[PDB]
Amino acid sequence: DMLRLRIMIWRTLATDTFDIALPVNQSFDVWATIIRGKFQTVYRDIIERVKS
Amino acid sequence: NHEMKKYTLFPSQFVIAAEHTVQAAYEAQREFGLDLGSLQFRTLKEYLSHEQDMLRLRIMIWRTLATDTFDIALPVNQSFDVWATIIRGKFQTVYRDIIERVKSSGAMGMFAGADAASFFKQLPKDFFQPAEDYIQTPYVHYIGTLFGNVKVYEVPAGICKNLTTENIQFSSMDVLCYVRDENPGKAGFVTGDAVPAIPFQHPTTPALVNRTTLWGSAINDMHPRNGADYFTRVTLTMAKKGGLNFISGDTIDA
Amino acid sequence: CTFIPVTRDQSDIYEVFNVAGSSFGSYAAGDVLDMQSVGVYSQLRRRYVLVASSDGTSKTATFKMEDFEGQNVPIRKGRTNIYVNRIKSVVDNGSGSLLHSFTNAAGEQITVTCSLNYNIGQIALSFSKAPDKGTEIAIETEINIEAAPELIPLI
Amino acid sequence: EMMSVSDGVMRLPLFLAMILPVQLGAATADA
Amino acid sequence: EMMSVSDGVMRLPLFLAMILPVQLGAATADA
């Protein structure tokens, strides 16, 4: 299992960055929506590259 | 007094073909069991339609003149309802300009990029109605409707880039708006089929060659009388003081 | 992870790709055609950009199919149009001519005359006076596949 | 070299699977 | 100039539709 994890982490090539610090004057709903949007975009990109 | 004028239309043609040899067909049959004729026929059949649909979009995007700009970044300390109302008002004004120019009425629609669709998917439930059981695909597909009138379609980033490497200009932040008109004499974009595709099968050549051809005629162009006024191109910027960009989730100069 | 049976040391996988057989239009030989493929192919009505940006001092411009295509291509008669600043004009005269006029930015009138050669697809343009600095010219025509039975794309 | 130890035996490739081209299409007929 | 291939025909146009001007008006009688 540890070797599986090592292979998966080592052979990755795609990278992305996203700041996660919560704004001072914002509730959790807006930040959760933004995070959901970002992750949906990431998965859309992975589906587009894979085409499956 | 009064005066008159005239306009004219005419269709175009298309043609495609495919061919293969007997030895290759027999080799494929013996090795893997595949048949070349059916595969080639099917590929031609799908590719003709696919190219026609892509050419339609190329035609629509190439011949627009109207432009508009807007900033989509959220304010740092604002909720989504107010921003959604502002978006709705801006888009209502944009659509009102089209009706003002063409002096008619009809359906409503819009073309959106990947990032624009991603932003639109973040709107509250009453503003945006997602498509039922929608699953993402890398095609040009329908993702739902917003405001209850406008139907939207998402253009993948790869298709946008493949358009951009041509002379056609388009970015993932660009948005195309259009109005479909059903009036008897007035229409924005017209299409039709003068002669459907006619398959042609040729007998085996004395050189042992099998060949198949397709031919037909159709019309795909914009209406000669006041065509392009039905379309506007809207681009969205992502730079304002005290805002957040969902691409990176960072404050902008604040 | 995904589980697959393994019984021997080597295992082979094969796939098939769609390939543009003929080098024509946007595509070339060996290019892959897929879901996101965009380009002109198997379509006869096409448009080309002649001048991206005028120099402000030229009165003539020539369009030859030998540039945007490999060789000479016949053109159907009475099916050509001229775009000036993405504004189209009437179709050409049947025999050999085309007449078009557009308004200058300062408000003057400029006339454009065109001479056509259908056999080799050559069109010559002449202006009454040089256009402005920022101006583009585009030409829309269609290929006379009847005259040339070849050049039909393949897959 | 010798068949007594490993690597000295020839190997038989095995045909596993075949992949066919995916469907093409677009949806721009609304306008 | 042969009739079989169906290009040498002279071809005839069609009427399609007629278009008339829309009505005019304004709503300023409230004041």
XYZ file of C-alpha atoms in Angstrom:
523
model
C 0.000 0.000 0.000
C 2.787 2.443 0.864
C 4.489 1.749 -2.477
C 1.200 2.362 -4.293
C 0.905 5.733 -2.562
C 4.526 6.585 -3.393
C 4.051 5.755 -7.083
C 0.851 7.795 -7.313
C 2.435 10.813 -5.637
C 5.701 10.599 -7.608
C 4.379 10.196 -11.148
C 1.999 13.185 -11.028
C 2.690 16.027 -13.471
C -0.226 18.496 -13.223
C -0.044 21.345 -10.706
C -2.430 24.012 -9.444
C -2.544 26.551 -6.621
C -5.384 28.099 -4.633
C -5.291 30.307 -1.539
C -7.654 29.042 1.158
C -7.438 31.746 3.851
C -10.914 32.850 4.887
C -11.790 36.536 4.368
C -12.353 38.350 7.647
C -15.882 39.634 6.947
C -17.338 36.623 5.114
C -19.529 33.732 6.204
C -18.709 30.120 5.377
C -21.344 29.703 2.642
C -19.656 31.983 0.095
C -16.212 30.488 0.697
C -17.631 26.965 0.439
C -19.282 27.884 -2.866
C -15.997 29.286 -4.200
C -14.099 26.161 -3.120
C -16.723 23.938 -4.750
C -16.428 25.920 -7.972
C -12.639 25.643 -7.993
C -12.710 21.888 -7.402
C -15.381 21.399 -10.075
C -13.164 23.296 -12.520
C -10.207 21.076 -11.590
C -12.230 17.905 -12.147
C -13.602 19.301 -15.416
C -10.011 19.819 -16.555
C -9.081 16.256 -15.586
C -12.110 14.886 -17.458
C -11.278 16.985 -20.527
C -7.706 15.677 -20.575
C -8.764 12.068 -19.959
C -11.836 12.225 -22.255
C -13.628 9.572 -20.202
C -43.858 58.537 -50.158
C -42.567 54.944 -50.128
C -39.663 52.905 -51.501
C -38.713 49.257 -52.021
C -35.671 46.979 -51.860
C -34.697 43.389 -52.642
C -32.499 40.607 -51.251
C -31.260 37.223 -52.458
C -30.158 33.841 -51.066
C -28.413 30.780 -52.499
C -27.001 27.516 -51.067
C -23.607 25.799 -51.336
C -22.169 22.288 -51.795
C -20.023 19.756 -49.947
C -18.288 16.501 -50.862
C -16.154 13.861 -49.134
C -14.814 10.401 -49.946
C -12.959 7.377 -48.597
C -11.300 4.323 -50.106
C -9.310 1.194 -49.283
C -7.731 -1.850 -50.919
C -8.800 -5.493 -50.958
C -5.575 -6.833 -49.439
C -5.806 -4.472 -46.463
C -9.432 -5.457 -45.853
C -8.614 -9.172 -45.938
C -5.591 -8.682 -43.670
C -7.688 -6.775 -41.132
C -10.411 -9.430 -41.311
C -7.927 -12.247 -40.689
C -5.897 -10.547 -37.946
C -8.448 -8.731 -35.768
C -11.756 -9.425 -37.522
C -12.487 -5.776 -38.310
C -14.257 -4.678 -41.492
C -12.986 -1.539 -43.209
C -16.061 -0.667 -45.271
C -18.506 -0.232 -42.397
C -15.971 1.699 -40.313
C -15.182 4.086 -43.174
C -18.873 4.580 -43.976
C -19.706 5.363 -40.345
C -16.751 7.732 -39.958
C -17.781 9.671 -43.067
C -21.386 9.830 -41.864
C -20.486 11.301 -38.471
C -17.726 13.587 -39.761
C -19.933 15.335 -42.328
C -22.456 16.378 -39.674
C -19.747 17.264 -37.152
C -18.038 19.575 -39.639
C -21.358 21.184 -40.571
C -22.113 22.008 -36.927
C -18.594 23.364 -36.359
C -18.843 25.506 -39.504
C -22.099 26.969 -38.198
C -20.399 28.170 -35.008
C -17.428 29.491 -36.994
C -19.809 31.519 -39.153
C -21.644 32.954 -36.145
C -18.475 33.938 -34.289
C -16.667 35.435 -37.292
C -19.314 37.991 -38.315
C -20.178 39.864 -35.098
C -19.512 43.566 -34.579
C -21.353 44.521 -31.394
C -19.211 44.506 -28.260
C -19.651 44.994 -24.524
C -17.551 44.722 -21.376
C -18.164 43.865 -17.733
C -16.312 42.946 -14.546
C -17.294 39.657 -12.917
C -15.195 39.597 -9.726
C -17.179 39.554 -6.494
C -16.800 42.425 -4.015
C -14.821 41.423 -0.944
C -17.685 41.829 1.573
C -20.824 41.139 -0.468
C -23.269 38.246 -0.705
C -24.271 36.410 -3.865
C -27.867 37.666 -4.144
C -26.932 41.301 -4.795
C -24.262 40.333 -7.323
C -26.727 38.002 -9.052
C -29.270 40.822 -9.312
C -26.629 43.110 -10.835
C -25.681 40.391 -13.336
C -29.341 39.891 -14.244
C -29.863 43.616 -14.792
C -26.740 43.952 -16.936
C -27.697 40.979 -19.102
C -31.281 42.237 -19.414
C -29.970 45.569 -20.705
C -27.630 43.762 -23.113
C -30.518 41.706 -24.497
C -32.729 44.809 -24.662
C -30.200 46.508 -26.941
C -30.572 43.692 -29.494
C -34.360 44.071 -29.587
C -33.942 47.840 -29.900
C -31.657 47.414 -32.911
C -33.632 44.718 -34.748
C -37.132 45.906 -33.701
C -38.538 42.390 -33.318
C -38.844 39.581 -30.771
C -38.057 35.898 -30.473
C -36.270 33.227 -28.479
C -33.315 33.826 -26.167
C -29.948 32.108 -25.953
C -26.279 32.570 -25.220
C -22.864 30.987 -25.759
C -20.409 30.908 -22.862
C -16.822 29.875 -22.259
C -15.578 27.385 -19.700
C -14.783 29.950 -16.999
C -18.005 31.870 -17.648
C -20.017 28.662 -17.258
C -18.074 27.821 -14.095
C -19.016 31.206 -12.640
C -22.644 30.826 -13.737
C -22.814 27.459 -11.960
C -22.097 29.257 -8.655
C -25.269 31.368 -8.744
C -28.114 30.693 -6.285
C -30.835 28.219 -7.174
C -33.558 30.644 -8.283
C -31.277 32.582 -10.650
C -29.719 29.520 -12.318
C -31.569 26.286 -13.060
C -29.090 23.470 -13.808
C -29.862 20.820 -16.390
C -31.372 17.623 -15.007
C -28.780 14.869 -14.444
C -26.128 16.950 -16.206
C -22.765 15.184 -16.549
C -19.774 17.080 -17.911
C -18.558 16.155 -21.392
C -15.788 17.670 -23.543
C -18.300 18.485 -26.305
C -20.318 21.664 -26.818
C -23.281 20.815 -24.600
C -26.253 22.357 -22.813
C -25.841 22.909 -19.070
C -29.166 24.537 -18.179
C -31.013 27.838 -18.192
C -30.848 30.990 -16.089
C -33.480 33.654 -15.340
C -36.021 31.201 -16.785
C -35.634 32.478 -20.362
C -32.026 32.284 -21.580
C -30.695 28.865 -22.565
C -26.929 28.518 -22.255
C -24.243 26.350 -23.842
C -20.693 25.760 -22.625
C -17.718 25.897 -25.003
C -14.761 23.772 -23.815
C -11.370 25.400 -23.342
C -9.737 23.134 -25.922
C -12.247 24.077 -28.614
C -11.743 27.747 -27.745
C -7.961 27.410 -28.070
C -8.301 25.547 -31.378
C -10.480 28.420 -32.583
C -7.924 30.946 -31.316
C -5.005 29.370 -33.190
C -6.969 30.210 -36.339
C -7.839 33.751 -37.367
C -11.035 33.479 -35.306
C -10.575 35.249 -31.970
C -12.150 33.819 -28.812
C -11.164 33.451 -25.147
C -12.487 31.413 -22.234
C -13.841 34.663 -20.753
C -15.735 35.619 -23.919
C -19.526 35.369 -24.168
C -21.726 35.378 -27.278
C -25.378 36.435 -27.080
C -28.016 35.854 -29.743
C -31.755 36.090 -30.379
C -33.578 33.540 -32.538
C -36.437 35.013 -34.574
C -39.336 32.933 -35.910
C -41.161 35.656 -37.853
C -42.147 34.668 -41.416
C -39.857 37.131 -43.188
C -37.289 38.061 -40.537
C -34.592 35.805 -39.095
C -31.104 36.177 -37.673
C -29.307 33.044 -38.867
C -30.784 30.767 -41.531
C -30.052 27.151 -42.407
C -31.524 24.478 -44.636
C -30.939 21.374 -46.726
C -31.399 21.817 -50.475
C -30.257 18.278 -51.349
C -29.525 15.592 -48.722
C -26.356 13.531 -48.854
C -26.417 10.872 -51.578
C -24.105 7.876 -50.989
C -22.310 6.509 -54.043
C -20.767 3.032 -54.141
C -18.341 2.164 -56.917
C -17.580 -1.394 -58.067
C -14.175 -2.959 -57.564
C -11.589 -1.250 -59.745
C -9.440 -3.511 -61.972
C -6.677 -2.350 -59.595
C -8.629 -3.931 -56.691
C -9.759 -0.695 -55.030
C -13.057 0.027 -53.266
C -14.179 3.659 -53.110
C -17.181 5.466 -51.622
C -18.268 9.075 -52.121
C -20.805 11.430 -50.557
C -22.306 14.535 -52.145
C -25.025 17.026 -51.302
C -26.028 20.661 -51.070
C -27.066 22.861 -48.156
C -27.299 26.500 -47.089
C -25.490 27.792 -43.981
C -25.115 31.575 -43.879
C -26.490 34.694 -42.238
C -29.638 36.419 -43.450
C -28.921 38.952 -46.234
C -31.262 41.620 -44.817
C -29.943 42.905 -41.475
C -28.190 39.743 -40.325
C -25.405 40.477 -37.852
C -27.470 42.838 -35.673
C -28.934 39.810 -33.851
C -25.588 38.988 -32.200
C -23.435 40.713 -29.585
C -20.090 39.655 -28.129
C -19.516 40.254 -24.413
C -16.150 39.833 -22.690
C -15.619 39.706 -18.926
C -12.658 41.186 -17.068
C -11.369 40.089 -13.667
C -9.597 43.159 -12.252
C -11.180 45.500 -9.700
C -10.098 46.939 -6.361
C -11.196 44.933 -3.336
C -12.314 41.819 -5.208
C -11.691 38.075 -5.298
C -10.879 35.972 -8.362
C -12.165 32.415 -8.006
C -9.385 31.175 -10.303
C -6.771 31.861 -7.611
C -8.893 32.918 -4.623
C -6.801 35.989 -3.812
C -7.596 39.631 -3.134
C -6.917 42.112 -5.940
C -4.767 45.037 -4.753
C -6.535 45.180 -1.387
C -6.347 1.544 -8.296
C -7.936 -0.751 -10.877
C -7.704 -4.546 -10.794
C -6.893 -6.502 -13.958
C -5.921 -10.184 -14.316
C -2.274 -11.000 -15.019
C -1.299 -14.428 -16.353
C 1.748 -13.833 -18.601
C 4.732 -11.498 -18.547
C 3.622 -9.253 -21.427
C 0.250 -7.877 -22.502
C -0.563 -5.793 -25.574
C -3.145 -3.048 -26.117
C -4.196 -1.540 -29.451
C -6.252 1.444 -30.568
C -7.346 3.096 -33.813
C -7.209 6.793 -34.707
C -9.076 8.820 -37.310
C -6.660 10.485 -39.735
C -7.224 13.067 -42.477
C -6.187 11.183 -45.601
C -5.613 14.167 -47.887
C -3.665 17.375 -47.231
C -6.379 19.887 -48.108
C -7.829 22.960 -46.451
C -6.815 23.574 -42.854
C -5.794 19.974 -42.178
C -2.718 18.170 -43.484
C -1.906 14.516 -44.060
C -1.635 12.459 -40.888
C -3.580 14.881 -38.690
C -5.947 13.397 -36.112
C -9.662 14.217 -36.204
C -11.559 14.068 -32.917
C -14.287 15.735 -30.868
C -12.517 19.104 -30.557
C -11.151 19.214 -34.113
C -12.026 22.498 -35.842
C -11.179 23.360 -39.431
C -12.402 23.627 -42.992
C -12.725 20.282 -44.776
C -15.097 18.804 -47.372
C -16.717 22.265 -47.598
C -16.490 24.255 -50.818
C -17.538 27.747 -49.685
C -14.535 29.304 -47.940
C -13.247 32.747 -46.988
C -9.714 34.133 -46.797
C -8.190 37.248 -45.250
C -6.294 39.211 -47.901
C -4.857 42.223 -46.033
C -4.625 42.079 -42.244
C -3.810 45.797 -42.016
C -3.494 48.364 -44.791
C -0.424 50.569 -45.129
C -2.528 53.625 -46.010
C -0.761 54.215 -49.342
C -1.556 51.166 -51.523
C -4.133 51.351 -54.318
C -3.976 47.722 -55.515
C -4.195 44.223 -54.047
C -4.106 40.820 -55.748
C -5.536 37.533 -54.470
C -4.286 34.234 -55.901
C -5.342 30.727 -54.908
C -1.692 29.686 -55.310
C -0.973 31.327 -51.939
C -3.734 30.057 -49.636
C -3.845 26.747 -51.542
C -1.202 24.528 -53.083
C -2.146 25.034 -56.733
C -4.631 26.714 -59.053
C -8.291 26.060 -58.241
C -11.289 26.920 -60.455
C -14.029 29.105 -58.983
C -17.747 28.978 -59.723
C -19.167 32.036 -61.456
C -21.493 34.462 -59.710
C -20.706 33.204 -56.201
C -18.015 35.600 -54.940
C -18.215 38.403 -52.390
C -15.901 41.056 -50.958
C -15.674 41.931 -47.261
C -14.420 45.366 -46.195
C -14.107 45.769 -42.412
C -16.309 42.668 -42.035
C -19.048 44.235 -44.173
C -20.065 42.235 -47.235
C -21.087 43.520 -50.663
C -23.179 42.253 -53.562
C -22.140 39.282 -55.671
C -19.917 39.783 -58.693
C -21.106 40.279 -62.243
C -21.529 37.089 -64.227
C -18.915 37.649 -66.917
C -15.834 39.117 -65.256
C -16.434 42.118 -63.003
C -17.458 43.341 -59.550
C -18.462 46.818 -58.361
C -18.452 48.010 -54.754
C -18.261 51.324 -52.912
C -17.778 52.205 -49.247
C -17.643 55.408 -47.228
C -14.348 56.756 -45.910
C -13.920 57.404 -42.195
C -13.596 61.128 -42.918
C -16.782 60.836 -45.006
C -15.457 60.576 -48.581
C -16.511 57.963 -51.145
C -14.201 55.219 -52.426
C -14.976 52.857 -55.314
C -13.503 49.364 -55.696
C -13.176 47.589 -59.051
C -12.422 43.877 -59.391
C -11.345 41.714 -62.330
C -11.824 37.960 -62.021
C -10.288 34.891 -63.666
C -12.327 31.765 -62.952
C -9.929 29.239 -64.500
C -7.015 29.894 -62.116
C -8.807 31.750 -59.316
C -7.082 35.132 -59.575
C -8.783 38.375 -58.526
C -7.259 41.852 -58.848
C -8.455 44.834 -56.807
C -8.001 48.535 -57.556
C -9.002 51.509 -55.410
C -9.883 55.058 -56.404
C -7.738 56.248 -53.492
C -5.691 54.583 -50.783
C -7.813 53.442 -47.804
C -7.147 54.391 -44.188
C -4.345 52.950 -42.072
C -6.503 50.438 -40.209
C -8.478 48.436 -42.763
C -8.815 44.743 -43.600
C -10.030 43.032 -46.776
C -11.585 39.562 -46.922
C -12.768 37.492 -49.887
C -15.443 34.775 -49.872
C -15.676 32.270 -52.735
C -16.473 28.613 -53.373
C -14.528 25.893 -55.162
C -15.833 24.573 -58.486
C -15.447 20.876 -57.703
C -17.160 20.094 -61.021
C -14.274 21.503 -63.070
C -11.677 19.589 -61.018
C -12.943 16.116 -60.019
C -9.765 15.606 -57.966
C -8.859 17.370 -54.678
C -11.682 15.450 -52.955
C -10.638 14.864 -49.315
C -10.139 11.376 -47.906
C -10.138 9.671 -44.502
C 21.266 -18.226 -21.694
C 20.688 -21.698 -20.267
C 17.055 -22.611 -19.611
C 17.857 -23.777 -16.060
C 17.922 -20.255 -14.607
C 15.346 -17.561 -15.324
C 15.583 -15.152 -18.296
C 16.619 -18.190 -20.377
C 13.041 -18.907 -21.509
C 11.242 -17.114 -24.323
C 8.080 -15.171 -23.508
C 4.720 -15.186 -25.286
C 2.936 -11.826 -25.664
C -0.771 -11.815 -24.849
C -3.454 -9.770 -26.599
C -5.415 -7.946 -23.898
C -7.853 -5.400 -25.344
C -8.664 -3.205 -28.337
C -9.819 0.425 -28.289
C -12.019 2.037 -30.949
C -12.378 5.744 -31.807
C -14.870 7.718 -29.731
C -18.041 9.371 -31.034
C -17.864 12.900 -32.454
C -20.544 15.565 -32.358
C -21.613 19.060 -31.396
C -24.759 20.973 -30.406
C -25.001 24.407 -32.055
C -28.457 24.158 -33.660
C -30.255 26.405 -31.146
C -29.387 29.678 -32.890
C -24.032 23.286 -71.541
C -25.742 19.921 -71.028
C -29.033 19.237 -69.271
C -28.097 16.003 -67.477
C -25.818 17.328 -64.719
C -28.374 20.047 -63.802
C -26.106 23.127 -63.811
C -26.723 24.677 -67.250
C -30.335 25.514 -66.405
C -31.228 29.203 -66.328
C -33.007 28.786 -62.915
C -35.957 30.902 -61.728
C -36.350 32.861 -58.476
C -39.268 32.763 -56.044
C -41.378 35.380 -54.276
C -40.998 34.153 -50.660
C -42.451 36.943 -48.487
C -43.585 40.583 -48.448
C -42.685 43.004 -45.650
C -44.712 46.064 -44.625
C -43.802 48.872 -42.199
C -44.752 48.520 -38.536
C -47.132 50.905 -36.778
C -46.084 54.092 -34.982
C -47.182 55.513 -31.654
C -46.223 56.814 -28.236
C -47.664 56.959 -24.710
C -47.370 60.518 -23.373
C -51.007 61.273 -22.464
C -50.622 60.460 -18.752
C -49.157 63.901 -17.992
